[PDB]
Design a protein around this ligand. Sequence first.
Ligand SMILES: Nc1ncnc2c1ncn2[C@@H]1O[C@H](COP(=O)(O)OP(=O)(O)OP(O)(O)=S)[C@@H](O)[C@H]1O
Ligand SMILES: Nc1ncnc2c1ncn2[C@@H]1O[C@H](COP(=O)(O)OP(=O)(O)OP(O)(O)=S)[C@@H](O)[C@H]1O
Ligand SMILES: Nc1ncnc2c1ncn2[C@@H]1O[C@H](COP(=O)(O)OP(=O)(O)OP(O)(O)=S)[C@@H](O)[C@H]1O
Ligand SMILES: [Mg+2]
Ligand SMILES: [Mg+2]
Ligand SMILES: [Mg+2]
Ligand SMILES: [Tl+]
Ligand SMILES: [Tl+]
Ligand SMILES: [Tl+]
Ligand SMILES: [Tl+]
Ligand SMILES: [Tl+]
Ligand SMILES: [Tl+]
Ligand SMILES: [Tl+]
Ligand SMILES: [Tl+]
Ligand SMILES: [Tl+]
Ligand SMILES: [Tl+]
Lengths: 524, 524, 524
Amino acid sequence: AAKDVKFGNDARVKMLRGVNVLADAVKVTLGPKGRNVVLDKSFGAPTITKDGVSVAREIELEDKFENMGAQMVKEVASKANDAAGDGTTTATVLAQAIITEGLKAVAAGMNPMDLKRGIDKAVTAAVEELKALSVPCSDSKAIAQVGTISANSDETVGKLIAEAMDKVGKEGVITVEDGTGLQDELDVVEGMQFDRGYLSPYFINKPETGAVELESPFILLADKKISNIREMLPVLEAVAKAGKPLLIIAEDVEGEALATLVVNTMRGIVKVAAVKAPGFGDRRKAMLQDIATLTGGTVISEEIGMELEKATLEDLGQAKRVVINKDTTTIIDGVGEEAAIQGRVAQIRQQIEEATSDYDREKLQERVAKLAGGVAVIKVGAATEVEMKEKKARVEDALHATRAAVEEGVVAGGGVALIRVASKLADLRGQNEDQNVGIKVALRAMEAPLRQIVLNCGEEPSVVANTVKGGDGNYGYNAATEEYGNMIDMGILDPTKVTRSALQYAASVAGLMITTECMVTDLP
Amino acid sequence: AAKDVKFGNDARVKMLRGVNVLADAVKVTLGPKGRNVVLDKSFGAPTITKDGVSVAREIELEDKFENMGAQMVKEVASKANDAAGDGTTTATVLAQAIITEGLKAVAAGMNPMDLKRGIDKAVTAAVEELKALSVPCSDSKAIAQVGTISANSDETVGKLIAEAMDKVGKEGVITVEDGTGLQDELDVVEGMQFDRGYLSPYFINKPETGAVELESPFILLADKKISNIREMLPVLEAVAKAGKPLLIIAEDVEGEALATLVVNTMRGIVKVAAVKAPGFGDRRKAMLQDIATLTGGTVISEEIGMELEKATLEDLGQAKRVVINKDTTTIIDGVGEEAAIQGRVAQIRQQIEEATSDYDREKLQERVAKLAGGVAVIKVGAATEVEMKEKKARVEDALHATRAAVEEGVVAGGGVALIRVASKLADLRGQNEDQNVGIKVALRAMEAPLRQIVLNCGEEPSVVANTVKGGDGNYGYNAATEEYGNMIDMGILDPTKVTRSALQYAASVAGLMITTECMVTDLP
Amino acid sequence: AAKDVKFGNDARVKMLRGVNVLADAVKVTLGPKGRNVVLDKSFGAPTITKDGVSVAREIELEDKFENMGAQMVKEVASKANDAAGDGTTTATVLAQAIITEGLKAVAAGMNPMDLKRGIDKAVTAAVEELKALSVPCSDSKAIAQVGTISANSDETVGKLIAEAMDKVGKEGVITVEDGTGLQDELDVVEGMQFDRGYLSPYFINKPETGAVELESPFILLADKKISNIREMLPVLEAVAKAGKPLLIIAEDVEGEALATLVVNTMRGIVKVAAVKAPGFGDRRKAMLQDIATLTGGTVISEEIGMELEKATLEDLGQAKRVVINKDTTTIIDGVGEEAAIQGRVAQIRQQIEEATSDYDREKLQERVAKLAGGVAVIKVGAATEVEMKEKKARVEDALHATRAAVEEGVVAGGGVALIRVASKLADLRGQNEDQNVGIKVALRAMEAPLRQIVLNCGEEPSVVANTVKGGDGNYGYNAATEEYGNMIDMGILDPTKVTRSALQYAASVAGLMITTECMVTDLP
Ligand SMILES: Nc1ncnc2c1ncn2[C@@H]1O[C@H](COP(=O)(O)OP(=O)(O)OP(O)(O)=S)[C@@H](O)[C@H]1O
Ligand SMILES: Nc1ncnc2c1ncn2[C@@H]1O[C@H](COP(=O)(O)OP(=O)(O)OP(O)(O)=S)[C@@H](O)[C@H]1O
Ligand SMILES: Nc1ncnc2c1ncn2[C@@H]1O[C@H](COP(=O)(O)OP(=O)(O)OP(O)(O)=S)[C@@H](O)[C@H]1O
Ligand SMILES: [Mg+2]
Ligand SMILES: [Mg+2]
Ligand SMILES: [Mg+2]
Ligand SMILES: [Tl+]
Ligand SMILES: [Tl+]
Ligand SMILES: [Tl+]
Ligand SMILES: [Tl+]
Ligand SMILES: [Tl+]
Ligand SMILES: [Tl+]
Ligand SMILES: [Tl+]
Ligand SMILES: [Tl+]
Ligand SMILES: [Tl+]
Ligand SMILES: [Tl+]
């Protein structure tokens, strides 16, 4: 394929032009005074949304070089979403502000490599300063406050989360599913969650969540890599019988057997999912047999001689419900006797004392907490059906925020956290003049999130940002009420984790983009 | 796919241009002095119609951005149709008037978010003012008056509706079907109606009721989500013996199970209809069993161990007819024993009296109201079939209006109801100047429906609207006779429900469209 | 000639586009942080200047309609210059801000005639409020302060003005000419100044002032309108003998006599100029004899029997310098007599002893105030013809500032005077909503001069204007030092007259331009 190549200044202006389209399409949806962005669909009515992720996903430009620019900063928005779930628009407004001001310096005739190091040092210092500004959420009374304001002043939502975290702990696994009737239910059932995602994106069946949800799915467990589907068939054929989906945990299922499972599921023939096993090597083999007893199935490995050809349904585990993130797989209520699991539990409790090491201890406790710790199931209750399904997603986006509120804490919202960090790093310097500007680029980029919220509110961003900088602490601007004051007292707050993710990722890409000299793409 | 993105003022003018096409094509058919709109078809003769829905459906513009605008306000027209069945043209004329005047303010330099809140507050106040202006229809003598004038001064139509409502009640289920002979018949047969419509559009046979219609159909009842059709087959091709259509009521009907049922009804090879089971969860199973008894069939569940691959024709329920709208499904004549149905009467009669929880008593009544409350059936008769048809249609074209006349009442027609509300909300104010204009935009939009009817009548709208505002009460303009007077006395009236729907929906979309800053569509 | 005609919105956007070119070309030169504008000349080097008048004069657009717009606001800049000599840029920045915001309202759908009345009422109130904010200059100590700061902190300049005003008075006539040597000289010589302009703008020899100037000149005086040169030859033929310029003061100079003298001075064959006879009718005939006695010549009129043919050298009058503005003739050091002037005065003062009417008195008083009041003359003195020309240049301009400082006073500079008036008229209302916006347009236009100065200074105008509004009084922003403080104490001040002229004129044109619906121009 014939290629087009652009160099230097010529190449960069095409990126800036490209990112500016994606940014300006997203930055308009920032804050509560945000604007609607309409996205066209071929089938019927257009989609009107404020969700910065949905808008970002749709952007793809005509000019191949511009497209690259745009597609580069898009990779950040989506990754910020993967880290926290929040702050995708806040990431993108930052990224733009670093790139626009960054490239200005490069064009002025400054060393890009010194500019990158200036930005990254300013960021590493900003993350460090941010941890100091963070107000932790320890007790289950302050945890309830975060879940309430995140779900639009709903006290019923925050009460459930606090009760769920009081059962499984702060490290425990909490999941939300559809309710049975009129009252919110809460049970702790035997389940497990491990840190591996879906094997391919086309496994999804949730129109919005980007998730794979399977009701009463049988579980196949394979220690060996599956290349050909020629081995899976005898199992797969018995899973079509008694039409219930299939979950494949293995070392790997990649190459041929994956694509044939993608062709099938999407065509409609049997709902299936594939997921890489947790961990690696010797500690994997154990974890898998842990799932196996908990899910009531049996492991199949080439090591003893058990091949998938001769694999009936007892080898297959049963679970009540499974959910698969982009980066996580989780199970709810597997079959497996009270004893059967708690028996395997003690078989790891012995291993705590028998093996004398530093690292070997951790893995055993991170296994027993997944397995004997349990899983929290909150079933939402309302009167009419559409009042339940609306109260469902409300809890889900009020949980993700609470999760981040526990791990790193909550900083002052309204983009004031960053603008407060900015004034506290004014004395920060690099090694040479070029690095010094690199810092000032990053510090002037931290003002942009606030400035963008004010712009949507109709007020002059310059005036408001200047007033917030003059006052000290958690004093900021409420765009909803057009009133100044203490942000924490006004319920305006952002989880520290989301703001840390938004800044770090946005700097990471800008750093790579500032050091760009050559672009190679396909010919129009 | 490469995308085109437009921002701000540039993006909005394409919407306005787009909505103006759909609006101007529809607003010409308003009132009785309305004009004909001709719609082209590839096969043979063009369709000449005044129906604002039929005209709206056909509009789809070339310019992708314009198309979006047009397709946005179309959603409303169709949704107003879903709420009432009337006032689709009245909705669209309103929507245009809010958008055109709204965007004018945005372009002047006013906050869209404040303009939206100004409109919505003016609307919430207008709905509240509308309820006060409403004249209720309580007794069955005033109910007969509404059915008479809605069917073009036909007294035979209004008499049947009043007799039907005197049998099953105001909450009762009333259905119209083809007559047997020369006299109008009225029986109450064992049937039920639940708040679930067709699961896919492609089930529609005749697009007049906008519904599925099945003669002598079997019914299947199962409390499970249908994965694959490799479960249905032994039943589907069992109903094909003796040759009759089938009804499918399952938790859901998704995936391959859905699409292959679609392909089989469409191509003719046995006609089936997929509808959800009503309510949810625990009273999902309960409300479904009610139907099983009513139909003389059986239930196939998840807990017990009953699968589809062993249900004979005996295991199926049966009916004389089923009517399936978008949000509705109603059954007629259940082959179930006269005692077995009455046995479930006692099985709910024991539940009401023995209820510790205060909520059950409410919905248990809403179970016997659909079971022992009944279903009324009117068979319209004449000497010629060409007047059996024409008279059959005249009853349904009077029932939908009577339904709304009972639920919320009837206001003064001629678009005077809204113009009367307009003068009564002149003192309404918001929080800032921008919100204040948002209200005045909505109030000047309420004048448009009347103004549009007068425009079709050839008279100057400005003069007539000014005369109607000067006088008070139910004093309006009769466009048919070119005479002023009391609207109620002249038989010109609109169901409160339709006018409330027309205003609310039209404001809802305008609100979303005013807050639009970015549009993303496919490249030409 | 074939014409092009544009109507309404189409016609207005061409004006706005047109004024925006002239405004943006001038507004960049506002304040002391102003930018340079380069003007091209066909002959040699381009002219680099900051003078808002020189820039305005040069603007003339290609698009005939755009040109009209631009040429309309240009008429104001030049007229502000005619009133004060200062504030031409400040006028233009105001005019733009009223037009831009004005037309926005017209396009929104508001009555132009109500918008004009709203602006004019806001202005009449602003001029009234401005008189209250003015700090008068009464004593000759505070008069010296104004002449010092206007001439770039030069105390020698301010000392001369104060000494000149102590001789002839505040109403007295003061003129500046070239010096003889090394010290500044000050004499009071027998002269007079009256209020008429030149008949041709092509008589102007020194364009920098925009004025006519003749050394040791001859003078004609005639109570008759001159139309033919056949009456003029034997006069003009005598002028080349004794090589010196000529000044005609006749009733009027018409058609031929005009076009003769205008072109026949371009050639360089006899420099001349012609101005209208001061006053009218009866008071016309005397004022001329005054001049004749003042100069030492004689008058010539058809009334008595005096023809223009036998007008010799002695019938002509002699001064030592005559200066003519757009609207200001001034005869300096007329070689009359001791006994003739003292005689004519003691005669005119006897007329007021026999004063019959209140008014007849006044115009007689004002007539000796001219004749017996004399003219003060200042001969600037410095080393070489480089600092002599420069000092004279700072004097002329500062005198002009001191003149206005006496008549109306001095307000607080930095454009704060207007922005202070703006906050004090916030409660001002009109008769209807459209008039109310007309006022708010004018009040937001008063902020622009300050905002434009800050823009040139590089600082954000929004931030600075917001800070000036918060504080009260003569507290403003110094753009030269980037410091806030009391403007009067910092020497930053504007003569009230100039700010009054700048506002009134800018509103006058904007008012006319807002009420424009049709434009007629020549075809391209
Ligand atoms: N009342 C408020 N006033 C000012 N800022 C607010 C207010 N409420 C929330 N915010 C800020 O809103 C910002 C978040 O904007 P969002 O619209 O959530 O975009 P995002 O989080 O970047 O991405 P999405 O769209 O959530 S996936 C947070 O940083 C809050 O500080
Ligand atoms: N004689 C009349 N004079 C004035 N208005 C009338 C008269 N008769 C009916 N109307 C008004 O006609 C309006 C309804 O217009 P329609 O043409 O029915 O449009 P629509 O109801 O919005 O949608 P369709 O076309 O019925 S689906 C009602 O609001 C009546 O108030
Ligand atoms: N140090 C200063 N800081 C801020 N404003 C100043 C300062 N010095 C002068 N000004 C303002 O400068 C404004 C005048 O700008 P100029 O450049 O003189 O334009 P103008 O007077 O409109 O027209 P010209 O160019 O003089 S004919 C006055 O209103 C002063 O208030
Ligand atoms: Mg967010
Ligand atoms: Mg209708
Ligand atoms: Mg000046
Ligand atoms: Tl957003
Ligand atoms: Tl299972
Ligand atoms: Tl606002
Ligand atoms: Tl219609
Ligand atoms: Tl049947
Ligand atoms: Tl008519
Ligand atoms: Tl200037
Ligand atoms: Tl004063
Ligand atoms: Tl002379
Ligand atoms: Tl500066």
